[PDB]
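Ticket #4471: complex job returned nothing on first submit. Input attached below:
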Amino acid sequence: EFSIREPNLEKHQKYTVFEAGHTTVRMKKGESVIGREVPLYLYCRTTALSK
Amino acid sequence: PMAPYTHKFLMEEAWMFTKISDPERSRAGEILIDFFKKGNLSAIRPKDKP
Amino acid sequence: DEKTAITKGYEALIKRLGTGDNDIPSLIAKKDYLSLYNLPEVKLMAPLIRPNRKGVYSRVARKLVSTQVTTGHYSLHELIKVLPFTYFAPKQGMFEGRLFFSNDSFVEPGVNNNVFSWSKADSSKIYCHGIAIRVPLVVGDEHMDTSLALLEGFSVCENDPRAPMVTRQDLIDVGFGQKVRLFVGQGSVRTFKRT
Amino acid sequence: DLAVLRDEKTAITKGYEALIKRLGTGDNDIPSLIAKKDYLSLYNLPEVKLMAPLIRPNRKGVYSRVARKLVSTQVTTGHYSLHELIKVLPFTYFAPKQGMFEGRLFFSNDSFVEPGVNNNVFSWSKADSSKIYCHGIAIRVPLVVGDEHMDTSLALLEGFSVCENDPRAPMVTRQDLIDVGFGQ
Amino acid sequence: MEMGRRIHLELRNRTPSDVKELVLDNSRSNEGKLEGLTDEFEELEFLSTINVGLTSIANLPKLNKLKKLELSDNRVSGGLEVLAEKCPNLTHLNLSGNKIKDLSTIEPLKKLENLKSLDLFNCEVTNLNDYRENVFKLLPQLTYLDGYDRDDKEAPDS
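Support reply: We reran it on our side without changes. The output follows.
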């Protein structure tokens, strides 16, 4: 999974996290939509499901 | 210790790419291929140290 | 009520036709659209237009009416739908396909809606708030050409899936003579060609 | 012979190679013009003239105004990003006009370049500042002039060469190599 | 490069007493600590330190004529009280991209009576509930936040 929020060791105990370069957010600027770069993170995790 | 995250997905802590939808390509494989073609996901290259 | 005000404004716009000179069809046949932007009924309906986006909606409506009238291809329904907004100074801005009214409601060009709905094979019956209104005239082809009432500087063309989907923002950059598929409503995709 | 892409992306890639081919030393070239703050000359270089037809003619003026503006800001202050300059110089051929800038600089082939964010059509990274990825094709940039990120002793090594010994010329530090004049 | 050489380069024989602007972007600073700055810089009115692996503010000298600062892309956290003594005449500040967790770290900025605009983007604090309002109630003198005033009034260019 993707995220833009650094992790907490206590909460994210089942997830392994990486730093996959950078992404870009996009927001209003009056009449035009601009973008600003930010770092991106990668939430790996192995889990089980069933029918 | 505190109870850790459990749900399969990540509520709130998710960043979502986005692309305009197509009714002729409304499937998982087609959507993933289309997202890959623009080269965003391909650019992702995770670093060794976690 | 605001809805009833809009209804009476639209009734006045419809009656203005009057099958006579100094009315909508005579100015149409004359191709003098500027006068349409100064009628009394639009002046009466103007206060019902949201102030913040008044300039942008005036701009878009003015462009649409001008483009349609210039070609002689038009459709009375979309015209009357968008006319009220062209009584102000057009100001640059961002349009998102919804000409919001002062009451928080909306009228989006080229899609039927409760506030104003036009059904094919029912040109005489103009459904406003689920109320049928007879038109004072008769038409069988003056309305059939709506290819120019959807967007501002484009025209419909034959369907083509190969063309890539696009959105309102990117339209400014599309090169000349390039087809562009894009939604015209809910799950309704229509190709367009700049012109 | 070992290629599957069409004439369009190949033409754009060739144009960018040609633009990077004028980054070499000597007068009448990009680095020397930047040193002389003569940004105006960049707009009449032969390779931009050759690459101009591709630019989307409908809005060529608006793009030209934005890219012609950015270079000046980069050129005048002395803080510039060589890669952005190369990316946006093809648009500086035509006369400026008036219009709204959405954010992307299109070509005639529905392929754009956004000024600042790496994309498939043109990519690079601050780690390896000696590669340009045009449609997944690696274009080596010569190392004739440093940039704010890439700046170091290495980024100039290619520019220099050995010559016949002359004892009159001065003896300088390694760091001062950045400041020496071309053809000195 | 390095803040020392970068600065010595920007200073083309100019004394460090007649400049009105300075830039140090895309450099590196040992220990994430400033190095080479002093009180000699008096006429300075602008500063920009971006992506230099910075983490704290301890070697910052006293700068009075300073009226604008930028610390983006670094990992600063905690030190925000020096501003009330070194740059009391400061008006514009920006911290997007740094490590900021709670509001207690922000409270000292109340003493900057000359403060007008602040920019907080991509920080952990931003992920809270009713944060714009709580900050505004903390710093009343403030009017602009991240380029937007109360009621989402976009600020002008400059």
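Strands of chain D lie at 105-106, 112-113, 131-133, 138-140. Closing as resolved unless it happens again.
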